Design a binder for this molecule. Structure first.
Ligand SMILES: Nc1nc2c(ncn2[C@@H]2O[C@H](COP(=O)(O)OP(=O)(O)OP(=O)(O)O)[C@@H](O)[C@H]2O)c(=O)[nH]1
Ligand SMILES: Nc1ncnc2c1ncn2[C@@H]1O[C@H](COP(=O)(O)OP(=O)(O)O)[C@@H](O)[C@H]1O
Ligand SMILES: Nc1ncnc2c1ncn2[C@@H]1O[C@H](COP(=O)(O)OP(=O)(O)O)[C@@H](O)[C@H]1O
Ligand SMILES: Nc1ncnc2c1ncn2[C@@H]1O[C@H](COP(=O)(O)OP(=O)(O)O)[C@@H](O)[C@H]1O
Ligand SMILES: [Mg+2]
Ligand SMILES: [Mg+2]
Ligand SMILES: [Mg+2]
Lengths: 200, 144, 50, 415, 412, 518, 103, 48
């Protein structure tokens, strides 16, 4: 459970899933819809942006005609990497590594939400909540490994946006938002629950 | 348009009129060049006589050994043929400006210029190029 | 118990563990209480004070 | 002690302790010291306070959160009151002063009860039962406004808008700020009158002018001029057209180069002339792509090139440079356009639509700030607030922000 | 490869090495007892470059500290940082080089070097990936200079390929009181160039200026100097001990920064001497931040290589390079190496190492002292007595004519 | 219980209002001498490098002087906004906003008025004040000759306050011609003020053209006629292609001799495309190197180098042409025209003189003065004069000054004070009496009476003459239409609104919080 | 070990260089698995692409970033390590029945 | 004698006033008048 400076402790509620901070404002974040009736979750690990491929950068080009083609090839493969994510119908995209502005705007046109800048401990909680799996390659994506839930709705919580998942038939996760006045109030509610949860 | 040359030494009476323009710079003499030349035509060199090294980065690659030999030969020729064309115009005195990013006159080029009896003077200020062209009536030369 | 360490980090707690920790105990015999609090807090998580 | 150095915690002599009754008197008097600051500020007849940051900048404010936020304190009891006002400011955005005065009122009355010898838990449990009992009574007595139509529901926002503006800055034009605050929400609202997005409306202040010069404009505020200002400043649409056909691009005008470091080797003069041909044909193909797309105004993120600016002036195509990515998020939602990544994916369906583009001076030499306006209702409203002083327009921002937050609370039903 | 040994020789060598280990141990995390209290994989997964995992995880650094003055070794040992180094590693033998290249070197190479070759052998046999050796010596002293020369030679013989990195401390003309400093510093370079593969120049005189200008300590103590030297060393070694590919591993460093073989000498540059990447840009290239006496603006950079740390992206640094190249063109050279970890104490630094023709000033100087102030054959009998002749000195001055020439040949 | 930290100055008593009120009085009295035509200039002593600065404007003075009072920052900030908005009337805002707080001081102390009542009267008093200017204004848009005469009298009013009170008769014609030159362009950046020390102050002039600060490079002539101007922002010099990853894989130096020749061929080809236009002058903003400079000699084209980007905008509009790049298509591109070009010398630095251009959408002013300090004052002057006249084009309505503007507001403000019976009438009267002080300090600076001269202006307006005002050269009441002094509507609207809202700031304080300095 | 850097002369190599990797790693990993192994103890840092194919077939990964920590584990199951990424020999494969993870 | 190691003899009032660093600003205005007299006329820089 995470910290939310601001609010009153009485207005908390029970959540059947996860609620994680985005921690970054993308260029095409507002274009995506905030409400999906039948969302589908797919966890990624590949970095979706235009950069060096595998820990190195060195490209020799002799002819100027091929210099135009090698740039178009980089633009070709990056959309080929994104199109494989689009063809399976993954509405929610999540990745530990950053996601560039090129990818999030491609997803923003056809109503596909995406997010990034999340920790590995948060990612492991996402898999057990939705019941999916981790896929670090876009070519080996299949329909069966996609997680699902009842609905999706991003709500304003303490001047911070959180992506809510809830209503799963079988959820392994319980994660409640701790809102309070001072930073010690939310801390005391955490330690009190952490001591009580171990007893039960 | 008036020029005053500052110099230490001498006496006040030594100040006199000079009918023509005087150069504050001195000769290199590094190579054995002329320092006087009667009935000489003064040409203003506004470029640099130096090994080829153009604006875009130039990485020279040597694949075979004949090539090391050739690169040297070709250069001892890029300076020679340019100096050969100076003999065609019979220009006897050259004046080079201050060179940036490289040497103004290569030491290998001074051997060709010193044997053909050509005075070489470098490290002239840029603003004085208007003075020399206006006085001597010589238009600058930026390319062969 | 209200404690403020050298870095001016405010904290309010009643747990043996947090309180003892927010305290850099240099005495050797007194750190036995710190160990059993962390040992009780790590496994059970209640009754540390007791 | 027994002669040996009896030390337990690190830095023994530096830190202190406090217990018994004297620990309580330090707490209640610390709240009274903060309450005296807030007590003379609350209400419509209050008085702002002036704060001084370490960097010399000042802020003339009368909102308990901004006062306590920029206040350098040492006592921890006031630092919890600093966060309580910040808690009320972040979520609701109304009553910061109250939460502070009210918490001190509970603390001041608790001082007399501690003298009687009541345990603090029984004191705390009493306020918890009394607080829920008061909330349970006040929930019954208040009436619902959802039965009324939309014409009267607008008046209820004007009742709360005049309440929030007053007690604050711009009391002079508060009747128009109430209409301006309500008019901002009429444009940006859900058809079901529920869960309106607050992030669509951003705050923007301008140092200059007077309060009367402020007005409503539906568009984006850019702090920059057009590229190479030889064109006319105010561009108009065509005679017959759906709009100006706004275009946005996250690609700078240059030849396509790899993102990785590259080494283009030219081993011949013939290949060097083809590089000159490749250099010119890319700029020629680029301006032909946006020409065939029908765009009039172009927005570039990473800026552009001297050679395309001229190509942009002859075709009557204004453009800008160094537009940040956060502003492009605001441009796409306002004009209802889709940002194309590159020119190969350029299509007429992705271009936006807005009424007109124009720029004014606001004075002598300050800066050329861009203005955009819409011809109908859109999902974006940008308040254009002016001010005679930097502290006036700075206080007018947080004052109008609290006004929109109070209207945001009324979007929730039956409150 | 995976590991590199670190020899430290001389009073200056031992001091700088003790400071360097004090920095390194705390960097990726080990109490001076060897135990690892660090968090987590990042600091542990390249700890095998300089520490030997023993059973029980009492990591112990692979360092050979040597000196002909029992006292310096002793002080360091009895001090803190005295549990880490294995007791057997220290090799220390009386009397004192006596601040003479000739004497100290020959006499104790005759003895201390044998013992050192012995320690360098078995302890190292212990690894499976020697990559090279890092020596910290003082160019101008006795033991350090003489022994360094001997050892470098001896090691190179027993380990042909193995790279060889040095961090010799050049002498301070003003603050080096001893008169026979240049006359040693000259004989040391004679052999440093023929053998070494990459070396870094640090001048005490330059260290004083930075200590008094930026730090503003009223009187520099050898300690301050040591701390600054330690910081640059730490950055260059992180270029090594943190998983990375930009200049990954020593040999790479060498390949990248050495245009031609007879030019080993580098000018360290480090900032934020007491933050945003644009802010640190100016500090790296400021003419006052160089730890070399010679001015680099009058000279000419040949291969630049900047090692950033802390939070920095690819593009923060690339954009910075694009902006900088544009204005200092007269002075395309660039090499970036972003790291992920941060300086102990500070969030982000940026070490700077560029080959520069300007070193020829620091050698024209030393040659001037060596020749002019010993045309009179001063203080030479101290050296002729040990056994070495004067023909060797003539060879030494001759080879500096050569160094200077080289730098002049690569048209300053 | 001291909740604050160490070294935290807090004032929660009457001293807080006294410290905030005395700070505005100190800022107010500092600028009382700078107001009016007889006002004295001030002298600033900088703390770094001994760089002095002589200036009469209150905005430059208050921004330069250090002041730690928070009340002083409001007077500094309101003056900065007025300097940026209109460019004139900054000292009037500073002295009026301080006098409103001065007049409000006695209400707090003597009469014991609530602070919310004083501001409430100023709201209704300021509303009636702006309504007086609504009826008191006059629109001279129907006739250009009368509007041409209005720009004269506004220049007479603005320039009289600075050191140019004698030479305003000559610069009034110079100022209004620059505005009619711009024909509505209110951007002040399109006027280049060339600073020249030496000569008589009246030696300034306004040539019909654009004067460069630089000269021709090497051998191009001074005097020419019928020159076609072409402007470029083009590198046009050692073209570094748009991708920096380009390289040459050279197998032999003989081939690299052809590559450097190819760089000269494309540059020779680029200059060959310039000659297709058939021009005689070429201008580029980047500094031109030696090789492209030489090719212009054989073609007979002049070359100018290192022009600033802000000057390219002025250069394009005076010439009337267009900035051209990518020279393959000369048909669509446009170029300007000029009759004669000649290099001149004003002092030591030579300049290029242009005359006889077609377009006249911009100009340049050449000032002449004894000291750099006088030249600076002069510069700052024409900037304040041209700024007011530039906004007069978009805001054609004008208002008569000379004490008549402040009094006709007080005539309407005093009338409304009776219909608001209660304790608010004293606040509205305080706003009225604050407006009487502007003609008082204007009389005190010239050394006349403060009571009797203002009393004659009081009785003259209520008799039914709304054109009476103060005349300082003789010290008596005279008609403003005959003397010919008038201000713009935006100026009087700005200072009344700025001084009114400035009084609202420091009347609601009840505590001053000072944290530690950093 | 000596300057491992990519080199792509044309777009045909750019397209195949990204998937070449997947294929190769996958091949080595499949090879490992046809032998029926379900847990592999690694000696140093493991890449993410290699991890994606290991947990596909449910192969457990264990970190032992030291020499002695890796040698002590071989004595339990009695396995003979080989640094190659090929097929483990069947005689050298160790025997472990269960691998539990509890608090 | 200037601040740096340069020494200069001067009869010209403009160069005398230029090299003299004056603390008073009004007396410093005479340095600019001599500069103005030197730029415009070039004679009588001390007579002004
Ligand atoms: N940079 C730096 N140099 C040091 C420091 N301590 C000593 N030195 C240098 O050490 C040099 C002389 O010391 P060494 O030559 O190492 O002394 P030594 O010959 O090892 O001592 P003996 O063997 O006893 O003769 C001087 O030039 C100093 O500049 C230090 O902390 N930092
Ligand atoms: N115009 C008004 N008439 C009557 N009461 C008002 C008016 N404006 C504000 N109030 C009252 O003043 C009290 C304090 O409000 P205030 O302190 O200004 O808001 P905040 O605490 O959000 O800054 C509120 O309880 C409100 O009812
Ligand atoms: N010759 C004159 N006769 C009458 N009144 C004058 C004369 N010259 C100036 N004034 C008055 O003096 C005032 C000068 O104001 P000014 O100094 O320009 O204010 P600021 O400097 O704040 O812009 C004007 O309002 C004008 O009415
Ligand atoms: N030969 C002379 N006999 C008498 N008076 C002279 C003679 N020469 C110059 N003067 C006078 O002395 C003054 C010298 O001024 P000068 O020193 O030349 O000023 P500056 O040095 O500033 O140019 C002149 O104004 C002139 O009247
Ligand atoms: Mg408990
Ligand atoms: Mg309120
Ligand atoms: Mg004025």
């Amino acid at each position: 459970i995470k910290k939310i400076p601001g609010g009153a402790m009485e207005e908390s509620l029970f959540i059947n899933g996860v609620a994680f901070k985005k921690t970054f404002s993308y260029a095409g974040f507002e274009q995506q819809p905030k409400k999906f009736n039948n969302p589908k979750i797919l966890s990624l690990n590949v970095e979706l942006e235009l950069k060096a491929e595998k820990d190195n950068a060195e490209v020799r080009v002799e002819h100027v005609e091929d210099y135009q083609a090698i740039v178009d090839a980089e633009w070709q493969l990056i959309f080929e990497k994104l199109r494989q994510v689009e063809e399976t119908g993954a509405n929610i995209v999540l990745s530990k590594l950053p996601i560039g502005d090129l990818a999030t705007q491609f997803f923003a046109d056809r109503n596909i939400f995406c997010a990034g800048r999340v920790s590995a401990d948060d990612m492991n909680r996402v898999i057990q909540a939705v019941g999916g799996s981790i896929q670090s390659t876009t070519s080996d994506i299949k329909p069966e490994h996609l997680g699902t839930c009842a609905l999706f709705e991003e709500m304003q919580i303490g001047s911070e946006r959180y992506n809510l998942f809830q209503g799963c038939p079988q959820a392994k996760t319980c994660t409640l938002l701790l809102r309070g006045g001072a930073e010690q109030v939310i801390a005391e509610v955490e330690r009190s629950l952490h001591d009580a949860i171990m007893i039960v | 348009d008036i020029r005053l040359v500052k110099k230490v030494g001498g006496t006040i009476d030594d100040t006199e009129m000079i009918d023509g323009v005087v150069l504050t710079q001195t000769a290199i003499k590094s190579a054995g060049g002329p320092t006087r030349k009667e009935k000489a035509k003064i040409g203003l060199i506004q470029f640099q006589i130096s090994p080829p090294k153009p604006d875009t980065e130039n990485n020279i690659i040597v694949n075979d050994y004949r090539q090391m030999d050739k690169i040297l030969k070709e250069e001892r020729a890029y300076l020679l043929n340019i100096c050969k064309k100076i003999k065609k115009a019979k220009c006897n005195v050259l004046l080079i400006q201050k060179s940036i990013l490289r040497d103004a006159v290569n030491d290998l080029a001074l051997h060709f210029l010193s044997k053909l009896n050509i005075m070489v003077v470098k490290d002239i200020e840029r603003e004085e190029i208007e003075f020399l062209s206006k006085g001597l009536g010589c238009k600058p030369i930026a390319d062969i | 118990i209200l404690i403020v360490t050298s870095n001016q980090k405010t904290t309010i707690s009643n747990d043996g563990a947090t309180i003892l920790k927010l305290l850099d105990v240099v005495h050797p015999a007194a750190k036995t209480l710190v160990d059993i609090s962390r040992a009780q807090d790590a496994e059970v998580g209640d009754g540390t004070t007791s | 002690e027994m002669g040996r150095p009896f030390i337990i915690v690190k830095d023994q002599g530096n830190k202190k302790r406090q217990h018994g009754l004297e620990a309580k008197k330090s707490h209640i008097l610390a709240a009274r010291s903060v309450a005296s600051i807030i007590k003379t500020s609350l209400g419509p007849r209050g008085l702002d306070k002036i704060l001084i940051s370490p960097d010399g900048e000042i802020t003339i404010t009368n909102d308990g959160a901004t006062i306590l936020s920029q206040m350098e304190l040492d006592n921890e009891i006031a630092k919890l009151l600093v966060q309580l006002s910040k808690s009320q400011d972040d979520e609701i955005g109304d009553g910061t002063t109250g939460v502070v005065v009210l918490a001190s009122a509970l603390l001041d009355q608790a001082l007399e009860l501690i003298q009687k010898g009541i345990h603090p838990i029984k004191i705390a449990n009493g306020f918890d039962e009394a607080a829920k009992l008061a909330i349970s009574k006040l929930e019954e007595t208040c009436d619902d406004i959802s039965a009324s139509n939309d014409e009267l529901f607008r008046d209820f926002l004007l009742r709360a808008a005049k309440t929030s503006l007053g007690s604050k800055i711009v009391s002079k034009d508060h009747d128009r700020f109430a209409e301006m605050a309500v008019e901002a929400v009429i444009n940006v609202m859900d058809k079901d009158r529920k869960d309106v997005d607050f992030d669509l409306i951003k705050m923007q202040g301008r140092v200059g002018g007077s309060i009367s010069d402020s007005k409503l404009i539906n568009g984006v505020i850019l702090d920059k001029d057009f590229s190479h200002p030889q064109m006319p400043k105010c561009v108009l649409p065509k005679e017959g057209s759906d709009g100006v056909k706004l275009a946005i691009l996250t690609c700078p005008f240059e030849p396509p180069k790899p993102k990785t470091k590259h080494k283009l080797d030219i081993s011949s003069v013939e290949e060097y002339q083809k590089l000159q041909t490749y250099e010119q044909d890319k700029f020629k193909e680029m301006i032909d792509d946006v020409k065939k797309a029908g765009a009039d105004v172009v927005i570039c993120q990473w800026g552009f090139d001297d050679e395309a600016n001229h190509l942009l002036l002859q075709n009557d195509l204004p453009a800008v440079r160094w537009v940040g990515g956060q502003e492009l998020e605001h441009i796409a939602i306002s004009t209802n356009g889709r940002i194309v990544p590159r020119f190969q994916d350029l299509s007429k369906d992705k271009l936006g639509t807005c009424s007109r583009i124009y720029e004014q001076e606001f004075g002598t030499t300050k800066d050329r700030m861009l203005i955009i306006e819409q011809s109908k209702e859109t999902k974006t409203v940008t308040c254009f607030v002016r001010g005679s002083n930097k502290m006036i327009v700075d206080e007018a921002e947080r004052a109008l922000h609290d006004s929109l937050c109070v209207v945001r609370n009324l979007v929730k039903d039956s409150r | 490869m995976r590991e590199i040994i670190h020899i430290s020789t001389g009073q200056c060598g031992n001091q700088i090495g003790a400071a360097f280990w004090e920095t390194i141990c705390g960097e990726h995390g080990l109490d001076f007892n060897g135990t690892y209290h660090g968090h987590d994989d990042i600091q542990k997964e390249r700890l095998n470059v300089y520490f030997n995992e023993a059973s029980s995880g009492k990591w112990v650094p692979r360092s050979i500290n040597v000196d002909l003055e029992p006292g310096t070794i002793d002080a360091v040992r009895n001090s803190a940082i005295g549990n880490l180094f294995r007791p057997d590693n220290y090799i220390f033998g009386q009397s004192s080089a006596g601040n003479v290249w000739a004497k100290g070197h020959y006499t104790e190479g005759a003895e201390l070097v044998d013992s050192v070759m012995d320690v360098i052998r078995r302890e190292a046999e212990g690894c499976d990936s020697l990559q090279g050796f890092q020596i910290t010596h003082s160019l101008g002293g006795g033991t350090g200079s003489g022994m360094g020369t001997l050892l470098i030679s001896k090691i190179r013989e027993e380990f042909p390929d193995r790279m060889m990195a040095t961090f010799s401390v050049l002498p301070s003309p003003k603050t080096s009181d001893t008169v026979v400093e240049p006359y040693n510093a000259t004989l040391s370079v004679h052999q440093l160039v023929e053998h070494s593969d990459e070396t870094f120049c640090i001048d005490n005189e330059a260290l004083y200026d930075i200590c008094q200008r930026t730090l503003k300590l009223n009187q520099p103590s050898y300690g301050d100097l040591n701390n600054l030297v330690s910081s640059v060393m730490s950055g260059v070694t992180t270029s090594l001990r943190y998983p990375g590919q930009l200049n990954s591993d020593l040999r790479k460093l060498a390949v990248n920064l050495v245009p031609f073989p007879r030019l080993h000498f580098f000018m360290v540059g480090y900032a934020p001497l007491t933050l945003t990447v644009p802010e640190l840009t100016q500090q790296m290239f400021d003419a006052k931040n160089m730890m070399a006496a010679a001015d680099p603006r009058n000279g000419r950079y040949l291969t630049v290589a900047a090692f950033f740390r802390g939070k920095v992206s690819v593009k923060e640094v690339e954009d910075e390079m694009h902006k900088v190249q544009s204005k200092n063109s007269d002075y395309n050279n660039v090499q970036t190496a972003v790291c992920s970890v941060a300086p102990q104490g500070l969030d982000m630094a940026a070490t700077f190492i560029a080959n520069s023709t300007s070193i020829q000033e620091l050698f024209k100087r030393v040659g001037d002292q060596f020749s002019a102030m010993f045309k009179r054959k001063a203080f030479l009998h101290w050296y002729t007595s040990e056994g070495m002749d004067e023909l060797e000195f003539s060879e030494a001055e001759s080879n500096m004519n050569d160094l200077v020439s080289e730098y002049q040949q690569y048209q300053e | 219980v001291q909740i604050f930290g160490d070294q935290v100055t807090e004032e929660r008593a009457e001293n807080a209002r006294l410290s905030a009120f005395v700070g505005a009085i100190a800022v107010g009295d500092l600028v009382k001498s700078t107001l009016g035509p007889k006002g004295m200039d001030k002298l600033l002593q900088s703390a770094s490098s001994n760089t002095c600065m002589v200036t009469n404007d209150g905005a430059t003075i208050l921004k330069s002087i250090p002041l730690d009072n928070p009340a002083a920052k409001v007077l500094v900030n309101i003056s900065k906004v007025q300097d940026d908005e209109v460019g004139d009337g900054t000292t009037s805002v500073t002295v009026l906003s301080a006098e409103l707080l001065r007049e409000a001081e006695k209400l707090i102390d003597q009469s014991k008025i609530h602070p919310q009542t004083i501001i409430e009267g100023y709201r209704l008093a300021s509303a009636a004040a702006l309504d007086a200017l609504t009826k008191a204004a006059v629109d001279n848009s129907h006739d250009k000759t009368m509007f041409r005469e209005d720009l004269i009298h506004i220049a007479k009013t603005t320039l009289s306050s600075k050191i140019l009170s004698q030479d305003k008769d000559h610069f009034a014609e110079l100022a209004t011609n620059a505005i009619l030159r711009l024909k509505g362009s209110t951007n002040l950046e399109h006027i280049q003020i060339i600073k020249i020390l030496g000569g008589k102050l009246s030696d300034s002039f306004l040539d019909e053209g654009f004067i460069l600060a630089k000269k021709f490079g090497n051998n191009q002539p001074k005097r020419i006629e019928n020159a076609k101007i072409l402007i470029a922002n083009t590198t046009l010099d050692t073209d570094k292609v748009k991708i920096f990853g380009t390289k040459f894989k050279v197998d032999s130096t003989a081939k690299l001799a052809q590559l450097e020749k190819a760089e000269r061929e494309k540059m020779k080809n680029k200059i060959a495309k310039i000659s297709k236009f058939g021009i005689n002058t070429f201008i580029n903003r980047q500094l031109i190197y030696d090789y492209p400079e030489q090719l212009f000699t054989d073609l007979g084209i002049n070359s100018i180098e290192h022009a600033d980007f802000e000057g390219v905008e002025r250069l394009a509009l005076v010439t009337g042409g267009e900035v051209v790049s990518t020279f393959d298509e000369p048909s669509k591109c446009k170029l300007g025209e000029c009759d004669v070009i000649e290099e001149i010398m004003l002092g030591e630095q030579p300049f290029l003189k242009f005359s006889g251009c077609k377009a006249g959408e911009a100009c340049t002013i050449v000032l002449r003065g004894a000291t750099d300090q006088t030249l600076d004052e002069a510069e700052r002057s024409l900037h304040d004069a041209l700024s007011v006249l530039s906004q007069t084009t978009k805001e054609t309505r004008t208002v008569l000054g000379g004490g008549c503007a402040e009094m006709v507001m007080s005539k309407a403000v005093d009338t409304e004070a009776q219909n608001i019976d209660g304790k608010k009438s004293l606040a509205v009267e305080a706003f009225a009496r604050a407006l009487r002080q502007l003609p008082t300090i204007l009389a005190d600076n010239a050394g006349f009476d403060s009571s009797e001269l203002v009393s004659k202006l009081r009785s003259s307006i209520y008799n039914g003459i709304s054109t009476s005002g103060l005349d300082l050269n003789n010290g008596t009441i005279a008609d403003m239409r005959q003397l010919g002094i008038v201000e713009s509507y935006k100026l009087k609207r700005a200072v009344v609104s700025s001084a009114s809202e400035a009084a609202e700031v420091l009347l609601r304080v009840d505590n001053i919080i000072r944290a530690r300095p950093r | 070990e000596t300057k491992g850097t990519v080199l792509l002369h044309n777009a045909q190599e750019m397209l195949d260089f990204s998937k070449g990797e997947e294929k190769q790693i996958d091949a080595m990993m499949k090879e490992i698995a046809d032998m029926g192994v379900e847990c592999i103890v690694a000696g140093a840092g493991v890449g993410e692409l290699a991890l994606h194919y290991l947990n596909r077939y449910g192969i457990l990964v264990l970190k032992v970033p030291s020499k002695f920590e890796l040698r002590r584990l071989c004595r339990v199951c009695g396995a003979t390590p080989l640094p190659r990424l090929g097929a483990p020999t069947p005689e050298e494969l160790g025997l472990v029945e269960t691998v539990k993870t509890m608090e | 004698k200037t601040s740096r190691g340069e020494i200069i003899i001067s009869n010209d009032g403009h160069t005398i006033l230029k090299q003299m660093a004056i603390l008073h600003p009004v007396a410093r205005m005479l340095v600019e008048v001599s500069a103005a007299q030197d730029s415009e006329a070039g004679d009588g820089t001390t007579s002004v």
